[PDB]
Amino acid sequence: EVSQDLFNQFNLFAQYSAAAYCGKNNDAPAGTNITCTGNACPEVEKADATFLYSFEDSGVGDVTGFLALDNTNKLIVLSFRGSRSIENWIGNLNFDLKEINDICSGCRGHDGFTSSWRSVADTLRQKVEDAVREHPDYRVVFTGHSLGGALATVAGADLRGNGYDIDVFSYGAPRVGNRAFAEFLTVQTGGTLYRITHTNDIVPRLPPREFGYSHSSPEYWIKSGTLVPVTRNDIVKIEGIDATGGNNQPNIPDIPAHLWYFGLIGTCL
Amino acid sequence: EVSQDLFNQFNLFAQYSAAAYCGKNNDAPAGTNITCTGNACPEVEKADATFLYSFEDSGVGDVTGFLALDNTNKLIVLSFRGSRSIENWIGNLNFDLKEINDICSGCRGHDGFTSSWRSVADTLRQKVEDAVREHPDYRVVFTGHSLGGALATVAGADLRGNGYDIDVFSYGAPRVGNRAFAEFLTVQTGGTLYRITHTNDIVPRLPPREFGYSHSSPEYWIKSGTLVPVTRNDIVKIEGIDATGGNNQPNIPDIPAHLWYFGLIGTCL
Ligand SMILES: *[C@@H]1O[C@H](CO)[C@@H](O)[C@H](O)[C@H]1NC(C)=O
Ligand SMILES: *[C@@H]1O[C@H](CO)[C@@H](O)[C@H](O)[C@H]1NC(C)=O
Ligand SMILES: [Mg+2]
Ligand SMILES: [Mg+2]
């Protein structure tokens, strides 16, 4: 229940997000080709994909990721990495909200996520703004898995509307803000947010709705199981803020489902 | 390629080997249903498979695994687990041989593998013969991945001939003995050994041939890639002792290939 072209984009940026974990380089020199261990990003390798900027443990919050240039699919991809130990990150995850009137009025965002992007915003903003210059005809995409998907969502909403669209592909991303921030991410122009979830993944269910958090619409839900390859007919678009019938169900969640988004993600062989 | 039935058996015992890693209850009571985390053994869960005897950190070489009763497929499965950390086990691997003339004269086996099996052979032989006694129409299968594949190979060659056939399914198993032991394993009576390898897996290339180690015949080589699903057309039968063309090729080996035998194995999500 998705166009074949959309399914390919979902698959391609899932591998870009996985490359933020399994890239052979975290302190790469700019210009080297992007490769993954254990065949984690086969389609990223097939393209003329090179680094533009890499960062490890930058700002505060340990923001890790890279900015890439794809000459085959005609993209500038900013990819954030999730936590190095997702099992640890889930348990020690804070729930405090912080007023983010700098993005939208009445909006409240997860304090950890918002403050992490700001500490790196001023640096990352020029790196994307220098890349969009030398390649204005290229599509700028923000992507990330787990915490990376949350960072890409905050970064996308903060840099949108300055001359270029920014599309965001998040995989297993947690809730990032309150109802007002969820409404903002749902209708904000200048790019499309693609929020991907997998079965009963626990992370898209955190922080709880009992703490004022809310999800943006729509949701692209993967019904196929863990370690099962994903097809076009295994994805359901679910419209509605905080809608049920997808990842937001009152059943018992699962951690392994967090690591299977079109393939192995969040870890490397 | 292999037949549809043999392909189904290759898949089933790969999950029995993977269950030795990702069994939820390692110190499981006898009679509890066999389940896995991360969907690591869905075919075992679908079957009426229960634990007969579970052993963890047993014997000398930290022998871990379980004996299982499968009433759906009429099987008595002895599954051996590999090393907890495959990377550290590959490095700290001795190449010392020890005479095992009581299995076959002129035969020498890897001193580590043979001594570990002997440290629990008496205990495990009784548990197996007890299960064969109450289910004489059941097939006895020894299986294992990595170090577990080596233990299943030497335990089969030892216990064979005592009234019940013993088939062995090994996945990514290293060499265990000299050429005299390889020819014995190749033509031994009372059961069939299925030695299964994947692309350029490093473990079936250890210990090196230059230290007096040989591989039994034949070889079932999975030529499909890592994180790629296996079809029956992706398995190649290769006859000949120490034959080349499958896993034994003059190229650079790979560790991730060791963790993909029909699915994720050797680690758990
Ligand atoms: C980098 O990628 C390009 C495009 O595929 C390729 O032609 C080039 O050889 C790659 N560089 C290396 C060192 O592999
Ligand atoms: C255990 O498995 C058997 C056979 O598959 C089934 O009849 C039984 O209901 C199961 N019980 C539990 C608790 O899983
Ligand atoms: Mg959201
Ligand atoms: Mg052998």
Contacts of A229 in chain B (CB under 8 A): 229
CB of B228 less than 8 A from some CB of A: yes
Nearest alpha carbon to residue A131 among A48, A71, A41, A59: A71
The count of other CB atoms within 10 Å of the CB of residue A40 is 24
**Closest approach of chain A CAs to the CA of B114, in angstroms?**
29
Give the whole-angstrom CA distance, residue B50 versus residue B108. Answer: 36
CB of A40 less than 8 A from some CB of B: yes
Instruction: For ligand 2, atom 12, name the residue with the nearest CA.
Output: B33
CB of A37 less than 8 A from some CB of B: yes
Catalytic residue among B146, B214, B216, B217: B146
**Closest approach of chain A CAs to the CA of B264, in angstroms?**
8
10 Å CB burial of residue B95 (0-12, 13-18, 19+) is middle
Q: Give the type of residue at B115.
A: S
Q: Is A25 in the pocket of ligand 1 (CB under 6 A)?
A: no
Instruction: For ligand 2, atom 6, name the residue with the nearest CA.
Output: B48
Give the whole-angstrom CA distance, residue A261 versus residue A15. Answer: 9
The gap from C-alpha B74 to its chain's centroid, in whole angstroms, comes to 19
Active site residue B201: yes
Give the whole-angstrom CA distance, residue B84 versus residue B23. Answer: 13
Residues 6+ apart with CB under 8 A from A199: A221, A222, A223, A224, A225, A226, A247, A254, A257
Instruction: For ligand 2, atom 11, name the residue with the nearest CA.
Output: B33
- Where are the domains positioned within chain A? 1-269
* Nearest-CB residue to B259 (from A229, A256, A269): A269
Residues A30, A263, B17, B171: is their CA dihedral positive or negative? Answer: negative
CATH superfamily entry for domain A1-269:
Alpha/Beta hydrolase fold, catalytic domain (3.40.50.1820)
* Resolution of the PDB structure in angstroms: 2.5
Q: Give the type of residue at A164.
A: Y
Resolved by: X-ray
Say if CB A247 and CB A260 are below 8 A apart.
Answer: no
Nearest alpha carbon to residue B145 among B41, B31, B39: B41
- Residue-wise burial string across A228-265, b where 16 or more C-beta atoms lie within 10 A, e elsewhere: bebeeebbbebeeeeeeebbbeeeebbbbbbbbbbbbb
Ligand nearest to the CA of B51: 2
SS3 track for B148-173: HHHHHHHHHHHHCCCCCCEEEEEECC
How many helices (H) and strands (E) chain B has is answered by 6, 10
Residue A38 and residue B226: Cβ atoms within 8 Å? yes
Ligand nearest to the CA of A71: 1
Across the strands, what pairs with B79? Answer: B66, B143
Q: Is B35 in the pocket of ligand 2 (CB under 6 A)?
A: no
Give the whole-angstrom CA distance, residue B203 versus residue A257. Answer: 29
Contacts of A256 in chain B (CB under 8 A): 37-39, 268-269
Give the whole-angstrom CA distance, residue A47 versus residue B41. Answer: 35
Residue A256 and residue B37: Cβ atoms within 8 Å? yes
